[PDB]
Amino acid sequence: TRDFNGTWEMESNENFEGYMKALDIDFATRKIAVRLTFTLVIDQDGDNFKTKATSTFLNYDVDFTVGVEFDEYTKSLDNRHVKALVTWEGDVLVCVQKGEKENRGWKKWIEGDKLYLELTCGDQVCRQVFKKK
Ligand SMILES: *C/C=C/c1cc2ccc(N(CC)CC)cc2oc1=O
């Protein structure tokens, strides 16, 4: 399936700290962020995605169109400029954030009712799993 619509509640989180440290996120923010769960809300209409991940503290809020590159300021996260592009590799949704950091981006896919997220920066991979509400 290429349909990621839903409210996705966090089931699993592995190595979020390594990903954030590879982005050089300030220590106090990273130490608080690694403790906190969050919910991922995806509104998808064709190529058009609105995604938002909300925790009691931090924010993640990105809208994009599959196949359309966009210049992105990463704002609240690590305050960097990247050229972001989201495409399909089969049923895996792949994002590359071209810029200073190597191997920066993510992959999302659905495997037996659960949403998998792999966040990558440099040699660090964070894996998260969510269940659909
Ligand atoms: C494709 C989904 C990406 C994604 C990336 C994220 C980056 C940072 C954060 N937080 C917690 C709200 C700040 C440390 C969350 C987040 O969720 C995602 O789904």
Sheet holding 6-14, edge to edge: 59-65, 48-54, 39-45, 6-14, 124-132, 114-121, 105-111, 92-98, 81-89, 70-73
**How far is ligand 1, taken at its centre, from the CA of residue 90, in Å?**
23
Backbone angles phi and psi of 43, in degrees to 5: -110, 115
Which DSSP helix (H) or strand (E) runs through 31? helix 27-33
Resolution in A for the shown PDB structure? 1.4
SS3 label, residue 55: coil
What is the best residue among 39, 52, 60, 75 to mutate for testing ligand 1's pocket, by most ligand atoms within 8 Å of CB?
60
